[PDB]
Design a binder for this molecule. Sequence first.
Ligand SMILES: Cc1cc2nc3c(=O)[nH]c(=O)nc-3n(C[C@H](O)[C@H](O)[C@H](O)COP(=O)(O)OP(=O)(O)OC[C@H]3O[C@@H](n4cnc5c(N)ncnc54)[C@H](O)[C@@H]3O)c2cc1C
Ligand SMILES: Cc1cc2nc3c(=O)[nH]c(=O)nc-3n(C[C@H](O)[C@H](O)[C@H](O)COP(=O)(O)OP(=O)(O)OC[C@H]3O[C@@H](n4cnc5c(N)ncnc54)[C@H](O)[C@@H]3O)c2cc1C
Lengths: 637, 646
Amino acid sequence: PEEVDVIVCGGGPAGCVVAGRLAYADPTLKVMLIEGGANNRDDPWVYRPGIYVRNMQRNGINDKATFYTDTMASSYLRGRRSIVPCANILGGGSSINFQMYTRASASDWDDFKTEGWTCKDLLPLMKRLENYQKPCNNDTHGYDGPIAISNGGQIMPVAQDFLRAAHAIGVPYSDDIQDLTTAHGAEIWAKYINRHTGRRSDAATAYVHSVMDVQDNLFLRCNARVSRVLFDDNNKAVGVAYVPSRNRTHGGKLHETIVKARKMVVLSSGTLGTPQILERSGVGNGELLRQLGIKIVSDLPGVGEQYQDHYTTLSIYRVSNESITTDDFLRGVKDVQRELFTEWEVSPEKARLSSNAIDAGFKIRPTEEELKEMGPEFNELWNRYFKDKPDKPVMFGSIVAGAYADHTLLPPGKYITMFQYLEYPASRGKIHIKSQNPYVEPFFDSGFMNNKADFAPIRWSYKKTREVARRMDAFRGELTSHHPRFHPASPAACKDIDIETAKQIYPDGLTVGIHMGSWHQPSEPYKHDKVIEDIPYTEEDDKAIDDWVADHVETTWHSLGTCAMKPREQGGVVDKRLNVYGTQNLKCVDLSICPDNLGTNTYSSALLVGEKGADLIAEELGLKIKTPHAPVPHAPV
Amino acid sequence: GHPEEVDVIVCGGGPAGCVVAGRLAYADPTLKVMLIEGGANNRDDPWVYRPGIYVRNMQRNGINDKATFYTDTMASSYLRGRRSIVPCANILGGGSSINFQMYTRASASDWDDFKTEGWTCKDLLPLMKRLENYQKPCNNDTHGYDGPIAISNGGQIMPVAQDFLRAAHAIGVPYSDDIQDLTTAHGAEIWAKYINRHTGRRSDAATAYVHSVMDVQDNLFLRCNARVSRVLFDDNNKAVGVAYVPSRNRTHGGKLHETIVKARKMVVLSSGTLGTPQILERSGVGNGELLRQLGIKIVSDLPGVGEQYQDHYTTLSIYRVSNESITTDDFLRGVKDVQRELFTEWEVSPEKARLSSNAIDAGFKIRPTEEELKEMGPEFNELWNRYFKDKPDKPVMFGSIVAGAYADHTLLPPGKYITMFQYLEYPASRGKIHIKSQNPYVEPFFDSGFMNNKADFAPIRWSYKKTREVARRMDAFRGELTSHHPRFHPASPAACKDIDIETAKQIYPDGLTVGIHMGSWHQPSEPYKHDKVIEDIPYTEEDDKAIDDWVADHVETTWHSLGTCAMKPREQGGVVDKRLNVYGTQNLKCVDLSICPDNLGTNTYSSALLVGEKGADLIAEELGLKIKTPHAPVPHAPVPGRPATQ
Ligand SMILES: Cc1cc2nc3c(=O)[nH]c(=O)nc-3n(C[C@H](O)[C@H](O)[C@H](O)COP(=O)(O)OP(=O)(O)OC[C@H]3O[C@@H](n4cnc5c(N)ncnc54)[C@H](O)[C@@H]3O)c2cc1C
Ligand SMILES: Cc1cc2nc3c(=O)[nH]c(=O)nc-3n(C[C@H](O)[C@H](O)[C@H](O)COP(=O)(O)OP(=O)(O)OC[C@H]3O[C@@H](n4cnc5c(N)ncnc54)[C@H](O)[C@@H]3O)c2cc1C
């Protein structure tokens, strides 16, 4: 058509819930979901979980991601221009992400300090979205929601190996680290995978294609980049203008098509996308819009400010050749890939590919002792933010059964990577547009490590995750190339592959065991007997780690906080009901609205914001949300 | 044994024929009905029920026997001296056993324009829903959900589909959830298939209407491999039965081996646009001068028997694509382990399998602007005013991306391809088919009649340019296949650009021959740049004339034959009643697409079924039978009666 009731802009977790719930709640209500990227419906490069890694390739084929590079270099990162991707496909992150089922701790929601948003307030909505298909010992999960959650088809022998090691350095085992209370414990790590079908638990098939298969009131435009919201003379959002995904017209001319809104315009276009739409619509910092030739609808300085992410570091460790890992599949060995593709088709329920291979991990929190060696600047964050907040973790740590790094830069053999990220950083960034044009790259700043308090925890994490690695059965060495630049004589210096493992990789190789060049100090072969003591570290080694953090820290795609929800005088952008200040009929509901960070992989969060926004809109339209939701394609119920 | 007498005899087991015999046999288990089909039985044959191998059925290779080839008796000045080949189906299920399985529906006005009571759109709307089991989302209530024939997006949509839509948006053809809503003249969709979403099997009419009934009742008789010669008549021109001969003429002395089977109540003719007129003519029902010259005793003088042969007119614009693109070419080539990988996939999981598609996964119906109408000349403008002007639901051209070449790969270079499959919705040009002898094995006179009306050139020309602009904007695009494109002057800015160097080297990394200019046989395209600004190919009068030549050289049938036994009054050369009775006879109907008095803007499987549904209703009431809903459950399908997921 040209006109409908609710327009949802962006087809991410949040957007898919809003559009899907409202369209099901009332079949009269015409809602249209507009998404920049492509439709994901029945795409074997979405619904199969194991091929997740490739959606982060800058290979000029991958069209499922937009890559946001920093405008200028950062001193704090020793001169590098940070890259932050995000989804360009229906589903958003849910079509391309690691599928790690994590949840925030309880206090995180209370620290929003906003009525409607306590843990207490959201707990029932949390249960409403979840389809929990694994055991636990608490009452904290839901069992008839759309989003299937499990340990997946098969757990890799390294998972329990990681756990055995975590126990040995005094992290306790728990059945569920996602019970809203835990900050220091270790688990088998669940996925957004259906235990029964082997399929990825995307938001689009759960909430949108579910509804489109049974009713005719839900409209979908994919390959459609929403330029701006259309405004009234009294600032009521009337409609929405989108352009084609490609800029491939005659003479590169703009081609806007307009769609009009009777009731609501919803901005679910992501932490990076949403502030851009608001800013080119005329809703942002007044100084910026003036210069850009944009008439001011509302003057909001915090639009596109306070960029919060999680700060990833990837410690990589060499493992035994008998170890089962993803590396040969990731390199694209032919009949490795044929085997796992065939195994998934025949038996999704036991298939290796029905997993993300991130099968174990922990949330961690430092000791009275450990806090002494983490510097003054972090201790000030601790006393203020953490000290009397026992349910908040400081670092995340998981085991990927394979290298998560360009294998074109990795030696042969088997790897595991320790996937770490900083939970509540103090650093902050920003994103502003440089034009009315919706094809120009915007100004961008990661803001990674611009606060000094963020080094001490990551450094701590490096030494900790390493003490685990060294205590595992599968461990053979540290990939020197991808590790800190310790001094060769420091006791903390790396030790690379041992000779027995090397010889196994190239049994007829002429180069194995040639000392010439002294490029590594090899490990002594594996002894199951070996007694192990913690690696000592000097102030020198601690500089080396910091330097390593500044050169190799990255985004975790856990982007939030650019349209913050807090009072307008503080800088915030939305009401408690997520209305953009000084407009009518306009709400921003996605991770943009977070005023404060969460201790979690953020698919659970984006969904929960999406459930809450559906509640708020539904009681504003006098509509009642159905439970359960429409039956979800390819699922037994 | 088999019966020597029954109630109703349906001659020809196509879509229409299958609806009739099925609906009636299910409507009364006492009613004895015999379906006689010239082709072979299609039941549980993996070269029918797998949608992915459809291409093979048009091979003229000495092996394939699921098609009869009718060639023009005389060269056509209009095609530049070439004799035109039109195949039709030679198998139970007719075209529904061997076609592209593209789900398309006529526009509302097409039916209205028959100008015959009982055949209005709103008259036929319930019968349209009665036959469908629609297995995809759409934002309308135009479809049915408990009919026999399953319709879906198939197992796996190709990445080039959504790419094609992006390019079609870039040139102002709008996206829509459903272009088959009897309403749309201008728009682009993901194109559905006559393929059962859950089983991944071909939704042919024989299994859906006939085999279903034969499983649960004893009163439906099937006689395959039986060419219907002629209709036996009474002294009062009542049809009293039918005589058939073997499919293969391989008897002692090359002799005529006729078996007779009598009909108590009705003889139905459903042998297709090409078949039915011949059966009528060699029975004594057609042009009197022709029948008097051939020594056939005249039953009914109908000059319009085998006149007004219409069709849709196809052109195939072939383009080269990136080597990382997913296409069908290697599978069509017969690369052993590509075939092996795809046959295995469909066996294990038909619900997601690439073979559960036709690979024709996106397209558009298109209508020109006033802007574009000026380009198209006086003889197409006279047609527009006369036919399309105040008929806003009628499209001029159809267009769909095939994810591969639809052409002899023996004549194609290596690499990967896509074709813009294009056809003319409502041609002005008309053809004819008449028999040459009483013998049912001699070839008839034939005349495609393609392009014998100059009005047809201009819209196809406009299609070439329009689909070419769509090609040029795609992510997968790597050039035109010069060899299979119009003969532009090489200095023209409309001249073809063939494969670029980077894509070429990928084809043959260790080839000694890649990059040799010598011969200058192709103007290479410059390598793919994601950023590239594109501008439309400009054309001249000379370029236009090149394309008109290309159209005359390379235009073909779309297998959408209709119109040989037109339903209109006898004094205007019509052949049948508004109840599809053959003028001058009793207890004889035609129910197949031969009856259509005017074209329909659609892939005609939908329309052939609808005429069968209508024919069943007409015969039912004549016999006082009520048609049962839903029909007998369909082999290999699951138990369904409203919109659902999978
Ligand atoms: C590679 C990756 C790995 C991750 N790892 C994990 C993990 O292990 N576990 C976990 O639970 N979560 C993970 N996440 C985090 C989580 O998926 C995201 O935080 C979540 O998807 C946020 O949802 P959103 O709707 O707020 O934004 P998004 O998911 O990014 O969705 C935004 C959507 O809006 C569209 N859009 C942008 N601009 C426009 C426009 N102008 N018009 C129309 N549409 C537009 C985009 O195309 C996109 O589809 C990860 C994310 C990614 C990308
Ligand atoms: C290769 C191909 C591609 C096509 N593409 C599409 C598409 O993508 N989508 C779509 O919707 N439609 C398509 N069509 C068109 C569609 O299949 C036909 O319009 C439809 O099958 C016509 O049905 P019918 O009953 O009118 O005649 P037919 O389907 O031709 O059936 C006639 C039957 O009569 C039999 N017969 C003929 N003469 C005699 C005789 N003397 N005695 C006994 N039996 C006889 C034949 O064996 C045949 O089985 C295509 C057809 C073909 C062949």
